[PDB]
Amino acid sequence: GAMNSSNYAELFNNDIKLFVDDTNVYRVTVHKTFEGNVATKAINGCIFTLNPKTGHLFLKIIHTSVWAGQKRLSQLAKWKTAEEVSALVRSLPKEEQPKQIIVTRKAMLDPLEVHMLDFPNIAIRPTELRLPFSAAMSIDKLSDVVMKATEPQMVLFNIYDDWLDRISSYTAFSRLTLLLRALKTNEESAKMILLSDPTITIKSYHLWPSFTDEQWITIESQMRDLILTEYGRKYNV
Amino acid sequence: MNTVPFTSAPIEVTIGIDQYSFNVKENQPFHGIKDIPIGHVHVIHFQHADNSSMRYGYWFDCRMGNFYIQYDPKDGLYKMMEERDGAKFENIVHNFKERQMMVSYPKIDEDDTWYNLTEFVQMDKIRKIVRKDENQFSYVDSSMTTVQENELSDPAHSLNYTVINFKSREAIRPGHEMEDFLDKSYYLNTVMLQGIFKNSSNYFGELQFAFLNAMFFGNYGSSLQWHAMIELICSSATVPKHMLDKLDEILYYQIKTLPEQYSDILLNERVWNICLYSSFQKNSLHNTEKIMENKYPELL
Numbered sequence: 001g002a003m004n005s006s007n008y009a010e011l012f013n014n015d016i017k018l019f020v021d022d023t024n025v026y027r028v029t030v031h032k033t034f035e036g037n038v039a040t041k042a043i044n045g046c047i048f049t050l051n052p053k054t055g056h057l058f059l060k061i062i063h064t065s066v067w068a069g070q071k072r073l074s075q076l077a078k079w080k081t082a083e084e085v086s087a088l089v090r091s092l093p094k095e096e097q098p099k100q101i102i103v104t105r106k107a108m109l110d111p112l113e114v115h116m117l118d119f120p121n122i123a124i125r126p127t128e129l130r131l132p133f134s135a136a137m138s139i140d141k142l143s144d145v146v147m148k149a150t151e152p153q154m155v156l157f158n159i160y161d162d163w164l165d166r167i168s169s170y171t172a173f174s175r176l177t178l179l180l181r182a183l184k185t186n187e188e189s190a191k192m193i194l195l196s197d198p199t200i201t202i203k204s205y206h207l208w209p210s211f212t213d214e215q216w217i218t219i220e221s222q223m224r225d226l227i228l229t230e231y232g233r234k235y236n237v
Numbered sequence: 238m239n240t241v242p243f244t245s246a247p248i249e250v251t252i253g254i255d256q257y258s259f260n261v262k263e264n265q266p267f268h269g270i271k272d273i274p275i276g277h278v279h280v281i282h283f284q285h286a287d288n289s290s291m292r293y294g295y296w297f298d299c300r301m302g303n304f305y306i307q308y309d310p311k312d313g314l315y316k317m318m319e320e321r322d323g324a325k326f327e328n329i330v331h332n333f334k335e336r337q338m339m340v341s342y343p344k345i346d347e348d349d350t351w352y353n354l355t356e357f358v359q360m361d362k363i364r365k366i367v368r369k370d371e372n373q374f375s376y377v378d379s380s381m382t383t384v385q386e387n388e389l390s391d392p393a394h395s396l397n398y399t400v401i402n403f404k405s406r407e408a409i410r411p412g413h414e415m416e417d418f419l420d421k422s423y424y425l426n427t428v429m430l431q432g433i434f435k436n437s438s439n440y441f442g443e444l445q446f447a448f449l450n451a452m453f454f455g456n457y458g459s460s461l462q463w464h465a466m467i468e469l470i471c472s473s474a475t476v477p478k479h480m481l482d483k484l485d486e487i488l489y490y491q492i493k494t495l496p497e498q499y500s501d502i503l504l505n506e507r508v509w510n511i512c513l514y515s516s517f518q519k520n521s522l523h524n525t526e527k528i529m530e531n532k533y534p535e536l537l
């Protein structure tokens with residue numbers, strides 16, 4: 001059924017699973033027309049498809065041309081997401097295909113279920129977790145590849161960098177969600193924390209800085225503080 | 238006009254014949270039902286006074302044979318049987334009529350209710366939904382499950398309604414996933430009408446039969462089938478105009494006939510609100526929407 005705090009360790013067992021987040025597939029800026037009406041202009045988007053155990057991110061870039069001449073785009077975006085996830089599953093060797101796909105928003109269930117009828121053994125599940133995957137576009141290198149795409153493209157990342165050499169996938173996921181929650185609540189401050197110290201850099205082949213274990217503890221503490229600070233600024237506490 | 242005689246009434250029972258119901262007391266001198274209109278299927282149904290568990294009954298057509306009811310004290314129910322000896326049967330019926338031991342199918346002359354509820358129901362199609370080929374009549378009861386219910390247990394005692402499942406490969410063409418899920422016209426017109434039912438009359442016959450089994454037996458799987466066949470039409474953007482007009486008439490008389498006090502269990506709020514107010518056909522069911530709104534405005 002649904003995924004929540006009671007079965008959280010299931011994410012890191014040895015059954016292949018993917019989270020699918022569609023919140024950055026259909027992106028727009030809203031603006032005034034010369035006539036004083038309002039219009040939208042789409043920008044490039046992306047499907048965020050993540051293996052939480054391995055960190056393997058399948059970033060399908062959604063180029064604005066896919067919306068050309070189409071109606072009901074927010075509805076179409078869910079079906080396009082499901083189309084692309086289904087295509088990805090079919091492209092993977094049988095032994096790499098997921099046993100479960102967890103969608104971060106319930107409106108993806110029926111589109112994905114319909115597109116995966118050929119895979120009756122793959123469980124399509126919602127989750128009660130509020131996951132911050134919308135903030136994926138606050139990761140500079142992911143945002144960059146999306147905005148530069150001139151055509152549909154799939155780009156593969158490891159969203160954990162090399163962290164699994166030193167920590168478990170439970171801890172890596174906890175770090176990721178804390179970083180993304182911080183970037184979602186106050187992007188400017190979160191990025192300031194991540195780059196304040198010029199001596200710690202992001203390797204060319206990585207997404208996040210090359211923090212030592214002790215430095216990650218400090219960073220993690222600063223991100224918690226930020227989320228609490230913002231919680232206080234928001235609610236006046 | 239035809240007759241279904243009863244050997245006797247050894248147990249107290251509420252008897253129904255189509256939309257009419259009457260009570261018979263234990264060992265009351267009762268020997269059946271006369272003046273049954275020829276030209277329609279009929280259903281004779283039972284609810285024991287001492288155990289309202291299991292409404293059960295028999296669908297039949299008097300043009301196909303001479304049928305009677307006889308209580309079986311071993312199996313504990315009123316059973317329909319066929320009498321092959323026609324002169325024997327005629328003589329039995331004539332004696333019971335002379336002794337005035339039979340109630341009369343109370344059809345008002347103006348009243349087209351039963352025709353309107355059974356317009357497309359045909360015994361031969363009933364006998365393919367209810368498989369028991371040695372008899373010309375068909376037994377249904379409260380508890381019988383459908384072929385689809387079993388998939389999700391005895392197959393001989395099943396209601397073999399046509400399986401409708403909106404999230405199935407049958408309903409969804411590869412590469413038209415969104416199209417076919419949001420507009421079921423392919424599934425209605427090509428898969429079901431052209432493919433399975435052959436014409437809208439057979440589709441409507443099964444829809445009407447499902448409703449009647451839901452209403453008269455409280456058969457839950459029949460209620461599911463009735464709602465599924467309505468939703469499949471309402472969720473199709475492209476439906477022949479004559480089918481929409483006929484569906485409106487069919488539903489109108491079903492809603493008109495439904496006991497007010499059973500509306501809570503026989504009507505699916507989600508399906509009806511979708512069909513009347515959100516679906517492609519939301520504007521095509523004028524008669525049904527008007528009676529629904531005046532009779533069950535709470536459900537909406």
Ligand SMILES: N[C@H]1COc2ccccc21
Binds near residue numbers: 259260340341343
């Ligand atoms: N209770 C009335 C209403 O319908 C019938 C049918 C047969 C005998 C009696 C009645």
